[PDB]
Amino acid sequence: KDMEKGVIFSDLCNFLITQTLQGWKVYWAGIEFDVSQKGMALLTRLKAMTRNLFPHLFQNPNSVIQSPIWALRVILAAGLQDQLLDEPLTGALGLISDWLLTTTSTHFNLRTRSVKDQLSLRMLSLIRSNILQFINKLDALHVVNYNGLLSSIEIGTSTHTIIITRTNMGFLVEVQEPVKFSLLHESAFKPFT
Amino acid sequence: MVPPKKDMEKGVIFSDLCNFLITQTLQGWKVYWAGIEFDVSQKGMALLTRLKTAMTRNLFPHLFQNPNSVIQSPIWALRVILAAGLQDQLLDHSLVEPLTGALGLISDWLLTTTSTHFNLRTRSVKDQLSLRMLSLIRSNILQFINKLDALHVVNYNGLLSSIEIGTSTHTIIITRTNMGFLVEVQEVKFSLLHESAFKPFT
């Protein structure tokens, strides 16, 4: 029983990052993601008419470009928030989501035992299948000339709003109530589609 | 003050590779190893136990007409298949890699014991477990499962229907049948893994 809990905790409460020749490989919840390093370049450069579509990002002194890793973390947090829309485990999902969203630590700490007692393979399996579903929901999106309703997903915590938008440059990701944003290349999700 | 990033990573990789986590479900078992989930059916043992006392009985007399063969669980079959995939991997590399020692030890553990935790106390090998290594392992296991999936069911004109992996110490044979994969180990033990376990990876 200690065994299962520890195995699950190792996978769910650590967000591993390793540098590769292409960018980074990330490992979380037993899923690998390859994150390309191309990104900050284009975004910071245009700070390609996508610019005009997002003036609040590219023409705003109070916007902050984040790394592609940040973009992935935000997306995973969003997937979790998306499962959250569905009770004692609800708080665990909440805490892990919060940790992914708002911190940059690679290891989830507080509150160790509380959350840990709820961890199981069944729960991790649900988390993984829901994450893959959310990814395919992102993949379902259409790149569209204008803003449009059909090219983005929005999830809204009590303390944050996450917008993920599919563009010609890949997945533009933004977090608001100031604004933080980044870009995740579509390649990161290619293995799951 | 707190374990460096590399030490947390090594711990996580150790936990994924050295725990074979087995849980009961309504359909059989769900196994978790190397960050990979497998749904294993508990069924099929009756068939085997009957045959052991057709074309199948004579096709595998060492299993079915041998009072000294021993039927194992499907979990054992999966363990043997994973062990075999690791041997397959380690044969493509050279001893000069930490990955070789690890693949070997993990494979021996999965293949020859039933324990669900592998007490790896060679600091040497543990200190070289990495996300790169685990990634290579996962890649190769899925590649191996795809080689198994592309086997034809044993047939009249000898279309490739099995894979054999030989160690200094064991011989592992995995054969495609109408009932899924018949797995055997000789130095005889055998079982059957229903093919649904591999369906998600096709």
Numbering used by the authors:
A (entry chain B): 15 to 61, 70 to 108, 113 to 203, 216 to 231
B (entry chain A): 10 to 62, 70 to 203, 217 to 231
Can I see the authors' text?
VP24, one of only eight proteins encoded by ebolaviruses, functions in virus replication and assembly, and is thought to contribute to immune suppression by binding to a certain class of molecules called karyopherins to prevent them from transporting a transcription factor termed STAT1. In addition to its role in interferon antagonism, ebolavirus VP24 has also been proposed to associate with membranes, and is important for assembly and function of the viral ribonucleoprotein complex (RNP), where VP24 binds to the viral nucleoprotein NP. VP24 adopts a compact, single domain, α/β structure of novel fold (DaliLite v.3). The overall shape of VP24 resembles a triangular pyramid of dimensions 73 Å×30 Å×30 Å.
